[PDB]
Amino acid sequence: ADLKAFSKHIYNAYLKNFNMTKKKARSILTGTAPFVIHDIETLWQAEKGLVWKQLVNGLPPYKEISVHVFYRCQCTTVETVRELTEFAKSIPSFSSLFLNDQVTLLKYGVHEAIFAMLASIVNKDGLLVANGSGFVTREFLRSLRKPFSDIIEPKFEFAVKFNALELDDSDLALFIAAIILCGDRPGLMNVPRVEAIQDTILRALEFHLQANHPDAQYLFPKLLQKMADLRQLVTEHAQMMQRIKKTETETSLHPLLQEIYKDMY
Ligand SMILES: CC(C)N(Cc1ccccc1OCCCCCC(=O)O)C(=O)c1ccc(-c2ccccc2)cc1
Ligand SMILES: CCCCCCCO[C@@H]1O[C@H](CO)[C@@H](O)[C@H](O)[C@H]1O
Ligand SMILES: [K+]
Protein backbone atom coordinates (compact mmCIF):
# COMPACT_ATOMS: atom_id res chain seq x y z
CA ALA A 1 0.00 0.00 0.00
CA ASP A 2 1.52 3.28 -1.21
CA LEU A 3 0.84 5.57 1.74
CA LYS A 4 1.50 8.87 -0.03
CA ALA A 5 -0.93 7.98 -2.82
CA PHE A 6 -3.46 6.65 -0.29
CA SER A 7 -3.35 9.86 1.74
CA LYS A 8 -3.76 12.01 -1.36
CA HIS A 9 -6.78 9.95 -2.49
CA ILE A 10 -8.48 10.36 0.90
CA TYR A 11 -7.67 14.09 0.97
CA ASN A 12 -9.27 14.55 -2.46
CA ALA A 13 -12.34 12.57 -1.39
CA TYR A 14 -12.62 14.85 1.62
CA LEU A 15 -12.46 18.02 -0.50
CA LYS A 16 -15.01 16.53 -2.90
CA ASN A 17 -17.56 15.68 -0.21
CA PHE A 18 -17.26 18.46 2.42
CA ASN A 19 -17.95 21.95 1.03
CA MET A 20 -16.93 23.69 4.26
CA THR A 21 -13.28 22.90 4.98
CA LYS A 22 -11.14 24.10 7.85
CA LYS A 23 -9.18 26.24 5.37
CA LYS A 24 -12.36 28.05 4.27
CA ALA A 25 -13.69 28.34 7.82
CA ARG A 26 -10.45 29.87 9.11
CA SER A 27 -10.36 32.37 6.27
CA ILE A 28 -13.84 33.55 7.40
CA LEU A 29 -13.20 33.43 11.14
CA THR A 30 -10.05 35.55 10.78
CA GLY A 31 -11.19 37.86 7.97
CA THR A 32 -17.58 38.99 3.78
CA ALA A 33 -18.06 38.80 7.57
CA PRO A 34 -20.63 36.46 9.10
CA PHE A 35 -23.84 37.77 10.58
CA VAL A 36 -23.68 37.30 14.35
CA ILE A 37 -26.55 35.37 15.97
CA HIS A 38 -26.60 35.94 19.72
CA ASP A 39 -30.30 36.32 20.73
CA ILE A 40 -33.86 35.83 19.49
CA GLU A 41 -33.94 38.99 17.41
CA THR A 42 -30.74 38.19 15.54
CA LEU A 43 -31.78 34.57 15.05
CA TRP A 44 -35.06 35.77 13.52
CA GLN A 45 -33.19 38.21 11.25
CA ALA A 46 -30.84 35.39 10.21
CA GLU A 47 -33.72 33.07 9.35
CA LYS A 48 -35.14 35.82 7.15
CA GLY A 49 -31.86 37.03 5.65
CA LEU A 50 -29.38 34.16 5.38
CA VAL A 51 -29.51 31.24 2.94
CA TRP A 52 -29.97 27.93 4.77
CA LYS A 53 -29.61 24.44 3.27
CA GLN A 54 -32.77 23.26 5.03
CA LEU A 55 -35.58 25.75 4.48
CA VAL A 56 -37.35 26.75 7.69
CA ASN A 57 -40.82 25.80 6.42
CA GLY A 58 -39.51 22.22 6.43
CA LEU A 59 -38.76 22.27 10.16
CA PRO A 60 -41.43 21.65 12.78
CA PRO A 61 -43.51 24.71 13.62
CA TYR A 62 -41.68 27.13 15.89
CA LYS A 63 -42.48 26.81 19.61
CA GLU A 64 -39.42 28.08 21.47
CA ILE A 65 -35.88 29.19 20.69
CA SER A 66 -34.11 26.27 22.41
CA VAL A 67 -36.02 23.65 20.40
CA HIS A 68 -35.68 25.56 17.16
CA VAL A 69 -31.91 25.66 17.73
CA PHE A 70 -31.98 21.90 18.39
CA TYR A 71 -33.80 21.35 15.08
CA ARG A 72 -31.17 23.40 13.22
CA CYS A 73 -28.49 21.27 14.92
CA GLN A 74 -30.32 18.09 13.84
CA CYS A 75 -30.59 19.37 10.26
CA THR A 76 -26.87 19.89 9.99
CA THR A 77 -26.12 16.58 11.71
CA VAL A 78 -28.21 14.62 9.19
CA GLU A 79 -26.68 16.52 6.28
CA THR A 80 -23.20 15.70 7.55
CA VAL A 81 -24.14 12.01 7.84
CA ARG A 82 -25.00 12.18 4.12
CA GLU A 83 -21.59 13.68 3.32
CA LEU A 84 -19.76 11.16 5.52
CA THR A 85 -21.56 8.29 3.75
CA GLU A 86 -20.36 9.54 0.36
CA PHE A 87 -16.87 10.23 1.74
CA ALA A 88 -16.59 6.70 3.13
CA LYS A 89 -17.80 5.17 -0.16
CA SER A 90 -15.12 7.16 -1.98
CA ILE A 91 -12.70 4.75 -0.24
CA PRO A 92 -12.42 1.56 -2.34
CA SER A 93 -11.78 -0.85 0.53
CA PHE A 94 -14.85 0.48 2.39
CA SER A 95 -17.16 -0.01 -0.60
CA SER A 96 -15.84 -3.61 -0.85
CA LEU A 97 -17.36 -4.42 2.55
CA PHE A 98 -20.85 -5.84 2.46
CA LEU A 99 -23.44 -3.11 2.84
CA ASN A 100 -24.41 -4.25 6.37
CA ASP A 101 -20.86 -3.68 7.65
CA GLN A 102 -20.81 -0.28 5.94
CA VAL A 103 -23.97 0.65 7.84
CA THR A 104 -22.55 -0.64 11.13
CA LEU A 105 -19.42 1.48 10.72
CA LEU A 106 -21.38 4.61 9.88
CA LYS A 107 -23.93 3.98 12.65
CA TYR A 108 -21.27 3.90 15.34
CA GLY A 109 -18.77 6.30 13.73
CA VAL A 110 -20.63 9.29 12.24
CA HIS A 111 -21.06 11.27 15.47
CA GLU A 112 -17.39 10.76 16.41
CA ALA A 113 -16.47 12.09 12.96
CA ILE A 114 -18.99 14.95 13.20
CA PHE A 115 -17.64 16.12 16.58
CA ALA A 116 -14.04 15.98 15.29
CA MET A 117 -14.98 18.00 12.16
CA LEU A 118 -16.90 20.51 14.30
CA ALA A 119 -13.65 22.03 15.58
CA SER A 120 -12.95 23.21 12.03
CA ILE A 121 -15.82 25.76 12.24
CA VAL A 122 -15.44 26.64 15.94
CA ASN A 123 -13.51 29.12 17.96
CA LYS A 124 -13.76 29.80 21.69
CA ASP A 125 -16.53 32.35 21.07
CA GLY A 126 -18.89 30.47 18.73
CA LEU A 127 -19.23 28.64 15.45
CA LEU A 128 -20.09 29.19 11.81
CA VAL A 129 -23.54 28.31 10.50
CA ALA A 130 -25.36 28.71 7.17
CA ASN A 131 -22.34 27.72 5.06
CA GLY A 132 -20.22 30.38 6.78
CA SER A 133 -22.65 33.28 6.42
CA GLY A 134 -23.64 33.23 10.10
CA PHE A 135 -21.78 32.96 13.40
CA VAL A 136 -23.67 31.74 16.48
CA THR A 137 -22.13 32.75 19.80
CA ARG A 138 -21.22 30.20 22.42
CA GLU A 139 -22.77 32.44 25.11
CA PHE A 140 -26.10 32.36 23.25
CA LEU A 141 -25.96 28.56 23.07
CA ARG A 142 -25.17 28.46 26.80
CA SER A 143 -28.30 30.55 27.39
CA LEU A 144 -30.69 27.93 26.03
CA ARG A 145 -32.79 26.12 28.56
CA LYS A 146 -31.81 22.77 29.93
CA PRO A 147 -31.37 20.17 28.52
CA PHE A 148 -30.34 21.77 25.23
CA SER A 149 -27.55 23.98 26.60
CA ASP A 150 -26.07 20.91 28.27
CA ILE A 151 -25.82 18.92 25.02
CA ILE A 152 -23.91 21.74 23.29
CA GLU A 153 -21.18 22.95 25.64
CA PRO A 154 -19.12 19.68 25.93
CA LYS A 155 -18.58 19.74 22.17
CA PHE A 156 -17.03 23.22 22.41
CA GLU A 157 -14.77 22.05 25.23
CA PHE A 158 -13.54 19.19 23.07
CA ALA A 159 -13.21 21.32 19.95
CA VAL A 160 -11.11 24.11 21.45
CA LYS A 161 -8.65 21.54 22.77
CA PHE A 162 -8.63 19.69 19.46
CA ASN A 163 -7.85 22.92 17.59
CA ALA A 164 -4.71 23.34 19.71
CA LEU A 165 -3.22 20.44 17.67
CA GLU A 166 -3.38 22.69 14.57
CA LEU A 167 -4.43 19.98 12.12
CA ASP A 168 -5.17 20.96 8.55
CA ASP A 169 -7.71 19.45 6.16
CA SER A 170 -5.22 16.91 4.73
CA ASP A 171 -4.66 15.58 8.28
CA LEU A 172 -8.35 15.61 9.12
CA ALA A 173 -9.22 13.57 6.04
CA LEU A 174 -7.12 10.68 7.33
CA PHE A 175 -8.26 11.14 10.92
CA ILE A 176 -11.95 10.98 9.92
CA ALA A 177 -11.28 7.92 7.74
CA ALA A 178 -9.66 6.22 10.75
CA ILE A 179 -12.70 6.97 12.93
CA ILE A 180 -15.11 5.39 10.46
CA LEU A 181 -12.95 2.34 9.69
CA CYS A 182 -13.00 1.08 13.25
CA GLY A 183 -12.84 -2.65 13.92
CA ASP A 184 -14.28 -2.30 17.44
CA ARG A 185 -17.89 -1.48 16.46
CA PRO A 186 -20.61 -3.79 17.84
CA GLY A 187 -22.02 -6.36 15.46
CA LEU A 188 -19.39 -6.02 12.75
CA MET A 189 -19.32 -9.07 10.49
CA ASN A 190 -15.85 -8.92 8.90
CA VAL A 191 -13.75 -7.64 11.80
CA PRO A 192 -10.34 -8.68 10.37
CA ARG A 193 -10.96 -6.86 7.10
CA VAL A 194 -12.04 -3.66 8.85
CA GLU A 195 -9.06 -3.89 11.24
CA ALA A 196 -6.73 -4.25 8.24
CA ILE A 197 -8.15 -1.19 6.49
CA GLN A 198 -7.98 0.79 9.71
CA ASP A 199 -4.36 -0.19 10.15
CA THR A 200 -3.47 1.06 6.65
CA ILE A 201 -5.22 4.38 7.37
CA LEU A 202 -3.32 4.73 10.67
CA ARG A 203 0.01 4.01 8.94
CA ALA A 204 -0.89 6.60 6.32
CA LEU A 205 -1.78 9.08 9.06
CA GLU A 206 1.57 8.68 10.78
CA PHE A 207 3.43 8.94 7.46
CA HIS A 208 1.46 12.03 6.48
CA LEU A 209 1.99 13.80 9.82
CA GLN A 210 5.73 13.15 9.62
CA ALA A 211 5.81 15.03 6.33
CA ASN A 212 3.24 17.70 7.15
CA HIS A 213 4.13 18.41 10.82
CA PRO A 214 7.87 17.71 11.02
CA ASP A 215 8.34 19.68 14.25
CA ALA A 216 5.31 18.39 16.16
CA GLN A 217 5.92 16.48 19.38
CA TYR A 218 3.91 13.33 19.82
CA LEU A 219 1.14 14.38 17.41
CA PHE A 220 0.35 10.86 16.22
CA PRO A 221 -0.13 9.36 19.72
CA LYS A 222 -1.98 12.56 20.70
CA LEU A 223 -4.49 11.85 17.91
CA LEU A 224 -4.90 8.20 18.91
CA GLN A 225 -5.91 9.49 22.32
CA LYS A 226 -8.36 11.96 20.71
CA MET A 227 -10.05 8.98 19.02
CA ALA A 228 -10.57 7.41 22.45
CA ASP A 229 -11.80 10.75 23.80
CA LEU A 230 -14.40 11.03 21.01
CA ARG A 231 -15.82 7.62 21.92
CA GLN A 232 -16.52 8.94 25.41
CA LEU A 233 -17.95 12.21 24.06
CA VAL A 234 -20.41 10.30 21.87
CA THR A 235 -21.35 7.88 24.67
CA GLU A 236 -22.33 10.85 26.78
CA HIS A 237 -24.07 12.50 23.84
CA ALA A 238 -26.20 9.44 23.16
CA GLN A 239 -27.12 9.23 26.83
CA MET A 240 -28.26 12.86 26.75
CA MET A 241 -30.29 12.29 23.56
CA GLN A 242 -32.05 9.28 25.07
CA ARG A 243 -32.96 11.47 28.04
CA ILE A 244 -34.32 14.20 25.71
CA LYS A 245 -36.51 11.49 24.18
CA LYS A 246 -37.97 10.67 27.60
CA THR A 247 -38.37 14.16 29.09
CA GLU A 248 -38.96 16.38 26.02
CA THR A 249 -41.74 14.39 24.37
CA GLU A 250 -42.90 17.31 22.16
CA THR A 251 -39.48 17.69 20.53
CA SER A 252 -39.12 15.91 17.21
CA LEU A 253 -36.18 13.56 16.71
CA HIS A 254 -35.19 12.77 13.13
CA PRO A 255 -35.84 9.05 12.45
CA LEU A 256 -32.33 8.51 11.10
CA LEU A 257 -30.83 9.72 14.37
CA GLN A 258 -33.35 7.52 16.22
CA GLU A 259 -31.99 4.52 14.30
CA ILE A 260 -28.41 5.58 15.06
CA TYR A 261 -29.09 5.76 18.82
CA LYS A 262 -31.21 2.55 19.01
CA ASP A 263 -29.27 -0.06 21.00
CA MET A 264 -26.59 2.39 22.19
CA TYR A 265 -25.92 2.49 25.94
C1 LIG B 1 -23.45 19.40 13.34
C2 LIG B 1 -22.72 20.24 14.37
C3 LIG B 1 -22.16 19.36 15.49
N4 LIG B 1 -23.67 21.29 14.79
C5 LIG B 1 -24.48 20.99 15.97
C6 LIG B 1 -23.76 21.21 17.28
C7 LIG B 1 -22.65 22.03 17.37
C8 LIG B 1 -22.00 22.19 18.59
C9 LIG B 1 -22.49 21.54 19.71
C10 LIG B 1 -23.59 20.71 19.62
C11 LIG B 1 -24.24 20.56 18.39
O12 LIG B 1 -25.34 19.77 18.25
C13 LIG B 1 -25.90 19.13 19.40
C14 LIG B 1 -27.25 18.53 19.08
C15 LIG B 1 -27.15 17.51 17.96
C16 LIG B 1 -28.47 16.77 17.88
C17 LIG B 1 -28.54 15.85 16.68
C18 LIG B 1 -28.23 14.46 17.17
O19 LIG B 1 -27.02 14.17 17.22
O20 LIG B 1 -29.16 13.69 17.52
C21 LIG B 1 -23.75 22.39 14.04
O22 LIG B 1 -22.99 22.59 13.08
C23 LIG B 1 -24.75 23.51 14.28
C24 LIG B 1 -25.74 23.77 13.35
C25 LIG B 1 -26.65 24.82 13.57
C26 LIG B 1 -26.55 25.60 14.72
C27 LIG B 1 -27.47 26.76 14.94
C28 LIG B 1 -27.64 27.27 16.23
C29 LIG B 1 -28.47 28.37 16.42
C30 LIG B 1 -29.07 28.96 15.33
C31 LIG B 1 -28.89 28.50 14.04
C32 LIG B 1 -28.05 27.38 13.84
C33 LIG B 1 -25.54 25.35 15.63
C34 LIG B 1 -24.64 24.30 15.42
C1 LIG C 1 -26.71 6.66 6.65
C2 LIG C 1 -25.58 5.94 7.39
C3 LIG C 1 -25.89 5.87 8.89
C4 LIG C 1 -26.94 4.77 9.12
C5 LIG C 1 -27.26 4.81 10.61
C6 LIG C 1 -28.57 4.07 10.93
C7 LIG C 1 -28.29 2.58 11.17
O8 LIG C 1 -29.41 2.00 11.86
C9 LIG C 1 -29.49 0.62 11.81
O10 LIG C 1 -30.01 0.24 10.49
C11 LIG C 1 -30.15 -1.20 10.34
C12 LIG C 1 -30.78 -1.44 9.01
O13 LIG C 1 -29.76 -1.25 8.07
C14 LIG C 1 -30.98 -1.85 11.44
O15 LIG C 1 -30.79 -3.26 11.30
C16 LIG C 1 -30.58 -1.40 12.80
O17 LIG C 1 -31.61 -1.79 13.75
C18 LIG C 1 -30.40 0.08 12.90
O19 LIG C 1 -29.84 0.38 14.19
K1 LIG D 1 -10.35 27.21 18.88
DSSP codes joined into one string, 59-77: SPPP--HHHHHHHHHHHHH
Q: Coil, helix or strand for 251? A: coil
Q: How far apart, in whole angstroms, are the C-alpha atoms of residue 231 and residue 228?
A: 5
Identify the burial level of 201 via C-beta atoms within 10 angstroms of its C-beta, where 0-12 means exposed, 13-18 middle and 19 or more buried: buried
Let me know: does 219 contact 206? Beta carbons within 8 Å.
no
* Sheet strands side by side (includes 35-37): 35-37, 134-137, 126-129, 122-123
The bound ligand whose nearest atom lies closest to the alpha carbon of 114 is: 1
Q: How far apart, in whole angstroms, are the C-alpha atoms of residue 98 and residue 217?
A: 39
Q: Cα(27) to centroid of ligand 3, in Å?
A: 14
| Nearest Cα residue to 220 out of 11, 212, 234, 120 | 212
Tell whether ligand 2 has an atom less than 6 A from the beta carbon of residue 111.
no
Identify the burial level of 18 via C-beta atoms within 10 angstroms of its C-beta, where 0-12 means exposed, 13-18 middle and 19 or more buried: buried
Let me know: does 68 contact 59? Beta carbons within 8 Å.
yes
Let me know: does 132 contact 31? Beta carbons within 8 Å.
no
Which parts of the chain fold into alpha helices (H)? 3-17, 22-29, 40-49, 65-89, 92-96, 99-118, 138-142, 148-163, 169-180, 191-212, 219-247, 255-261
Ligand 1-lining residues (CB < 6 angstroms): 37, 43, 69, 72-74, 76-77, 80, 111, 114, 118, 127, 129, 136, 151-152, 155, 241, 257
Q: Cα(95) to centroid of ligand 3, in Å?
A: 34
Domains parsed from the chain with CATH numbers: 1-265 (1.10.565.10)
